[PDB]
Amino acid sequence: GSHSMRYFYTAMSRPGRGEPRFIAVGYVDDTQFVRFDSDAASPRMAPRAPWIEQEGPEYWDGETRNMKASAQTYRENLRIALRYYNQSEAGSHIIQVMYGCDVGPDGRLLRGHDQSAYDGKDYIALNEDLSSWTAADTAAQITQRKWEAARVAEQLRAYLEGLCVEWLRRYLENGKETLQRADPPKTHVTHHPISDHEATLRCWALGFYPAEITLTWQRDGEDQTQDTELVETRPAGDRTFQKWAAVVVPSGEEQRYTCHVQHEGLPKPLTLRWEP
């Protein structure tokens, strides 16, 4: 199917406690494959998936050099942001960045991304054209002006259409046994009385990959969106994900409720019910 590669950077200042920490992680789809942490005893870009381990020392040395350079850039950006927002040197602040590419089954670019935040709010984003920027406020407009003058968007576009897609295709081939395998959810419905008058039906999905899934309850064939409790999809720790959806139902009406599961590992959506 379709696939993505994403890098996520977090830079966190901590006045009085040294220089800002810089952490980077890389993902293909929902699989982390690299990390870098400036607080490690010996900072290096390090593998986090088996299929990246075969990259040679030139790869790891180059990625480590790039992360060290990026840490320096984002430490400077934290100082610049203080000026742009008229902020004191006493507070802790955070820059976040996400960038990468999405490809289709043919491996061709579907779209690229490059967006940043300051203190958890949008700061600046590369538009889908990979040629212009959206600035969230008058501070980010200063950055936008600098990046327009230096034709930064052209450099992002070159990466996103070139090396980003090329490396993603390589990783997908090297990791094809996992990255190109969908694991369908294992599903069941549980029932727990809450009183003499009502019971909870909980529809479970376990063991699935990738994380995207839809779990819905219907009553008499109508979606129960506003009466369904839906937990956030959560990692199991073995690459797979878990989720549940619950509804409170009148006792004796349980068979009027059906749970519907959609996942890319299922050739057809599943319908299930409580099976006493």
Binding site: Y7, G62, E63, K146, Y159, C164
Partner: peptide
Amino acid sequence: ASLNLPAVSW
């Protein structure tokens, strides 16, 4: 592989 973007600051 990560983006190598030298000499670009906010």
